[PDB]
């Protein structure tokens, strides 16, 4: 029949049954959460496009349950197997692509925090990804999906679906090598991006460099905070060279000096020098009065979250304002990494040795072990339709 | 961050004691087993000599760490020796993991599916392992291993060896994720391979079957005692060194790290034990 055969005919009918029911509930409810949202916009498109990918897979699951309940016999017409295989490839790589693009969006939102045609970009990208993956998945519709073999007992035959690999196929090896190398290349980008977001939003600023990294941004993680030190020193040099800003600056403590520096990085010496009254309240250590007067500016209307953070730093002289910043993003980063390492990485680790075993290039004792592993990763990869809807909690839930 | 290291005096007591014991015992047991092989299945014997060479490399670095921890974490010796110490410690850790795993797989295919080609195959595979591991270990030679930092008592400056970690480094963290994941991938292939050996050896229907079954247990003993404690701690500790944790966790995981580092060194003394359970 097959190497891993024994348990696969029991595994998939149970595993895929749970997944079918949970995944149809989770993605169906997610289309209720999406519908009830008319007031993030770009991320919303990727999420809805990701659900569209899940629906395509979920609908094929009844066919796999029956195929495995029939001891691996594809009794329906051949093209329904072509379509089933095709939609599996679509689900997997649209999910890899849409999780990838959600990660990049959030990375740019944290790393570079600076039109309503952002929606036009989410739609533009989603289409590129669909054309790229549906185009690649189309090859599954031109293949001979099934192979007929004599049954072990009786007078019958067994019709396998996308299990047959012509012994020693070279295109198969090149295609499977490309996909795995392209996957871990994509996985490395995702891992780096989500670890930057996490690193940035976990590690609470204790200086002006870390403080301006949250509010203004800064690419990757380097120590050679030394280049940015130069920009701050040049900013302080000018502040002290300004008769309107020097008395206040000199009078302030190091944490409050950073808040003034922050303001200067945002609106410049010119901008900050036009806060005569608020600056006088600071020079006189009238923290609450200064804080209240600072909230009565256009700065507060224009950038409220940064203003609130800087005003708090002026009021308290502590870094508490930067303790739990952008938690929607911090949790998004963890969730995308969970969905990636759980669902996609196991399958992609097991993929190249299993293809080599299935092209015969590996021994019978290993071929049997890697086949068993393969059935487990194929189940892990299917949990994606139940797991990936969790990301919607970024849109709904507040911290 | 180097200021958080003045709180752990434990390592300066632990390493000079434990590394002196490991050095002497190891140099003896390894020097001894090199005479066992000199006064002489054949493929397995090739992996064992190489595995003993990985041990010697690290054993020769032990007197340097003894001196280092003796001088309260001050690398009094030349700074280049620090790169060489780190390099050889990495070689020892992963040449051991590879050669033990390659021994485990030799006995797996020799039990589940049983001369001049095996000797040549074993040398091939052995040279692959050295090239792969020494290739990665060589990156320790191009780093800035040493960092001058103040001492617990006064304004005096000590020189650390491979203790500096750039705050919030994502690539340092990615490397450690790669190595910890690869280790548990390699270890689980080993765990399965060995457990199949002990299962097939427990259910076979006299002396040949009795030694190879008890050998699969030695490879597991070495993995669970020496390598698994360290690779469990490696990630939580790395995170602590990159500033991703609290001071309370920092101290807990750093102390555990000293224990697992000592436990990793016991592999020099525990792996020559495989020589008898086969030859
Ligand atoms: C992912 C992927 C992939 C990417 C590119 C080429 C692929 C694959 C691919 C598969 O790994 C693959 C494996 C099993 C099947 C069919 N399949 C089977 C037999 N059981 C399944 C349980 N869930 C989903 C699909 C299942 C399939 F349609 C594609 C086989 N491919 C292939 O080269 N074939 C010649 C089928
Ligand atoms: C294993 C491994 C590894 C793999 C990849 C990168 C590694 C490491 C690595 C280490 O774990 C590491 C830790 C401590 C030391 C130095 N070290 C110290 C301070 N005490 C030691 C006692 N025994 C052996 C080595 C000792 C080292 F050379 C390497 C540090 N690495 C690193 O990121 N550095 C910036 C040195
Ligand atoms: C015969 C079987 C093989 C054929 C398989 C066909 C796969 C389906 C193709 C696209 C999914 C459609 C959903 C997403 C495509 C629209 C992209 C877009 O612009 O997203 C707009 C967004 O939803 C605005 O809110
Ligand atoms: C960009 C990646 C393309 C993605 C999927 C292509 C999957 C199609 C797999 C085609 C190999 C099937 C096979 O066995 O064909 C033998 C070969 O073409 C000798 O003529
Ligand atoms: C050309 C670029 C990608 C095509 C790779 C997918 C090829 C899958 C089609 C396999 C097939 O049936 O075609 C056999 C042909 O010889 C194989 O080029
Ligand atoms: C064939 C021998 C494989 C060794 C089994 C060790 C298993 C322990 C897992 C990770 C630590 C070792 C990481 C070594 C992986 C190679 C990375 C590298 O950069 O090495 C360069 C190499 O020479 C050019 O490919
Ligand atoms: C697997 C093979 C690599 C094994 C050892 C090299 C580890 C050395 C890592 C030391 C990094 C030094 C650093 O702080 O630089 C950051 C850099 O961007 C990061 O590549
Ligand atoms: C085709 C050319 C490809 C070449 C591209 C390299 C591929 C990196 C491979 C493994 C990671 C090795 C980790 C690199 C070690 C970091 C060393 C470093 O950054 O330098 C020392 C620094 O000054 C701190 O003291
Ligand atoms: Zn097979
Ligand atoms: Zn530390």
From Swiss-Prot, chain B:
Disulfide bonds: 82-161
Tissue: Expressed in the placenta, lung, left and right heart ventricles, heart atrium, leukocytes and differentiated HL-60 granulocytes.
Record SUPFAM superfamilies: Family A G protein-coupled receptor-like
GO BP term, pick one: G protein-coupled receptor signaling pathway
GO cellular component terms attached to this protein's record: membrane; plasma membrane; secretory granule membrane; tertiary granule membrane
One Pfam family, short name: 7tm_1
Single GO molecular function: lipopolysaccharide binding
Topology feature Cytoplasmic, residues: 36-46, 106-121, 194-215
Extracellular compartment residues: 1-13, 67-83, 144-172, 237-258
Keywords: Cell membrane, Chemotaxis, Disulfide bond, G-protein coupled receptor, Glycoprotein, Membrane, Receptor, Transducer, Transmembrane, Transmembrane helix
TM region positions: 14-35, 47-66, 84-105, 122-143, 173-193, 216-236, 259-278
InterPro entries attached to this UniProt entry: GPCR_Rhodpsn, GPCR_Rhodpsn_7TM, PAF_rcpt
Induction section of the entry: By CSF2/GM-CSF, IL5/interleukin-5 and n-butyrate.
Membrane topology: Multi-pass membrane protein
Locations listed in the record: Cell membrane
Glycosylation sites: 157
Subunit organization: Interacts with ARRB1.
Function, in words: Receptor for platelet activating factor, a chemotactic phospholipid mediator that possesses potent inflammatory, smooth-muscle contractile and hypotensive activity. Seems to mediate its action via a G protein that activates a phosphatidylinositol-calcium second messenger system.
Family the entry assigns: Belongs to the G-protein coupled receptor 1 family.
Protein name: Platelet-activating factor receptor
Primary gene name: PTAFR
């Amino acid at each position: 029949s097959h190497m891993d055969s024994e348990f696969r005919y029991t595994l998939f009918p149970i595993v895929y049954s749970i997944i079918f029911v949970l995944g149809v509930i989770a993605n169906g409810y997610v289309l209720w959460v999406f519908a009830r949202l008319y007031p993030f916009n770009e991320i919303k498109i990727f999420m809805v496009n990701l659900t569209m990918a899940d629906m395509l897979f979920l609908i094929t699951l009844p066919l796999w349950i029956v195929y495995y309940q029939n001891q691996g016999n594809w009794i329906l017409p051949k093209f329904l197997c072509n379509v089933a295989g095709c939609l599996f490839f679509i689900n997997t790589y649209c999910s890899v692509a849409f999780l990838g693009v959600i990660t990049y969006n959030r990375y740019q939102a944290v790393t570079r925090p600076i039109q309503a045609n952002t929606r036009k970009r989410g739609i533009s990208l989603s289409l590129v990804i669909w054309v790229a993956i549906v185009g690649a998945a189309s090859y599954f519709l031109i293949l001979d999906s099934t192979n007929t073999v004599p049954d072990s007992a009786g007078s019958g035959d067994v019709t396998r679906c996308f299990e047959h690999y012509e012994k020693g196929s070279v295109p198969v090896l090149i295609i499977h090598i490309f996909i795995v190398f392209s996957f871990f290349l994509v996985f490395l980008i995702i891992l780096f991006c989500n670890l930057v977001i996490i690193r940035t939003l976990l590690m609470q600023p204790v200086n002006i460099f870390e403080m301006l990294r949250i509010d203004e941004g800064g690419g990757s993680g380097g120590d050679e905070e030394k280049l940015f030190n130069q920009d701050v020193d040049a900013a302080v040099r000018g502040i002290l060279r300004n008769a309107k800003l020097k008395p206040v600056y000199d009078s302030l403590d190091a944490v409050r000096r950073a808040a003034l520096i922050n303001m200067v990085f945002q609106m410049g010496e010119t901008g900050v020098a036009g806060f005569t009254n608020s600056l006088r309240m600071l020079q006189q250590k009238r923290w609450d009065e200064a804080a209240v007067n600072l909230a009565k500016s256009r700065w507060y209307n224009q950038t409220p979250n940064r203003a609130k953070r800087v005003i708090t730093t002026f009021r308290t002289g502590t870094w508490d304002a930067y303790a739990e910043v952008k938690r929607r993003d911090l949790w998004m980063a963890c969730t995308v990494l969970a969905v990636f390492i759980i669902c996609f990485v196991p399958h992609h680790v097991v993929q190249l040795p299993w293809t080599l075993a299935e092209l015969g290039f590996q021994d019978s004792k290993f071929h049997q072990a890697i086949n068993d592993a393969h059935q487990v990763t194929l189940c892990l990869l299917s949990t994606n339709c139940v797991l990936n809807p969790v990301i919607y909690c970024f849109l709904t839930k507040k911290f």
